[PDB]
Write a protein that binds this DNA or RNA. Structure first.
Ligand SMILES: [Zn+2]
Ligand SMILES: [Zn+2]
Ligand SMILES: [Zn+2]
Ligand SMILES: [Zn+2]
Ligand SMILES: [Zn+2]
Ligand SMILES: [Zn+2]
Lengths: 86, 87
DNA sequence: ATGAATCTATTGGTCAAGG
DNA sequence: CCTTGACCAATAGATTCAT
């Protein structure tokens, strides 16, 4: 089948459905811990790795108690989302 | 009473043969084993499909340098090399 | 450094036409 | 009834940006 916007045609209709999301902006797969959403379930699994993998220490946000695997990520979360509280 | 219902989940089928393949997702049975790798599936035509990743009627075939496993897609061969041959 | 976005090849489960 | 291949979502990994 053919792409509406790009016009790029691929042998895979499943991949085209994902590609059309980039034009449409649809993000069906929503994270259960934050506002993040994406067009591919695999990419959401990758995102979920940043909320704390089992077996490693997990840092929670001081304000909203959101889990993060990496401390620098939690710092970026603070600046992006809790700047209004300073 | 026609053996159209899954004993594990209760799904009903209009084709009893579909129940036979479906049930293997509950039992883990995978009778169709690929002869060119360790792949194994529960549906005959799925193994037929997977074998297309090993080669075509003509086209070109890339074989792993170490284990001589054939591939039709080079990127797949690269993933195989990293997965099995890190030495 | 950490992670999202893009890309694509392969796979699981479904289903029913037709053999 | 069984075989078979199309269909769609899911998966896994690689590359390419963004911050
Ligand atoms: Zn497009
Ligand atoms: Zn999240
Ligand atoms: Zn927070
Ligand atoms: Zn079942
Ligand atoms: Zn194989
Ligand atoms: Zn090999």
């Amino acid at each position: 089948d053919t792409c509406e916007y790009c016009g790029k045609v691929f042998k895979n209709c499943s991949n085209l459905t994902v590609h059309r999301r980039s034009h449409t902006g649809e993000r069906p797969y929503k994270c259960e811990l934050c506002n993040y959403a994406c067009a591919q379930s695999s990419t959401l699994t990758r995102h979920m790795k940043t909320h704390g993998q089992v077996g490693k220490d997990v840092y929670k946000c001081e304000i909203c108690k959101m889990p993060f695997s990496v401390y620098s990520t939690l710092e970026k979360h603070m600046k992006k989302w809790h700047s209004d509280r300073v």
